[PDB]
Write a protein that binds this DNA or RNA. Structure first.
Length: 221
DNA sequence: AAAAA
């Protein structure tokens, strides 16, 4: 899940999670309009602080000063709560990245075919994220990562990993500051949306190039 | 201290 789509209005996503009284997010009717969201860009990221939901543009990627590699973009759910690197983000930096769906490339010989993956019921997805707070500082090295899970049932046909997607109710509980890291692991386990709830279809190979941003990139070929 | 083109 190193690319996804985040194209609808803020309200299209937020309406499933919280009413205005729970937000500290200015109203904006403009569609976010991103059909091809890539690592290293800032991405609108949802989190909870001061008992309200906030939406900040956060660097997709995580590379601390002692990190000598390209920034990581994913954290494995099997070990993130335990990892020396990720445990602090699991404790303090939980967030939600909402999206329309995500892209994965199925390797077929030496060729790669992209797929777009989305909820069969038409709802947006709420991907579990962890990252470096305070999110609102706009850091360009220590941002957020998307938590991954082992691909299950049908998704294994495309790729061996998938984003950890939470139900709207679990997404809300995941973001709460007053729940512990062990509570968050319970929420991740019980709130995970199973693979049977997703559909997918091949898309244009044009999505490979981050310059391309058209609505057609999520349409079937 | 780990996991897209």
């Amino acid at each position: 899940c190193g690319r996804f789509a985040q194209s609808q209005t803020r309200e299209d996503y937020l309406a499933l999670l919280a009413e205005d009284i729970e937000r500290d997010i200015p109203y904006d009717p403009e569609p976010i309009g991103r059909y091809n969201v890539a690592p290293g860009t800032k991405v609108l990221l949802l989190s909870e602080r001061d008992e309200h939901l906030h939406l900040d543009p956060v660097f997709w990627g995580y590379a601390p000063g002692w990190w000598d590699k390209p920034p990581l973009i994913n954290a494995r759910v099997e070990t993130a709560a335990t990892s020396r690197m990720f445990k602090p983000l699991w404790q303090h930096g939980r967030a939600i990245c909402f999206a329309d769906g995500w892209f994965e490339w199925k390797k077929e010989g030496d060729k790669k075919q992209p797929f777009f993956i989305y909820r069969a019921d038409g709802q947006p997805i709420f991907m579990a994220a962890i990252g470096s707070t305070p999110f609102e500082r706009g850091d360009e090295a220590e941002g957020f990562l998307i938590v991954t899970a082992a691909a299950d049932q049908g998704l294994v046909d495309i790729h061996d990993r998938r984003p950890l997607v939470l139900s709207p109710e679990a997404a809300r509980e995941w973001m709460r500051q007053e729940i512990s890291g062990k509570e968050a692991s319970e929420i991740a386990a019980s709130g995970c949306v199973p693979a049977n709830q997703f559909s997918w279809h091949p898309v244009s190979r044009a999505v490979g190039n981050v310059k391309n941003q058209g609505a057609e990139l999520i349409q079937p070929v």
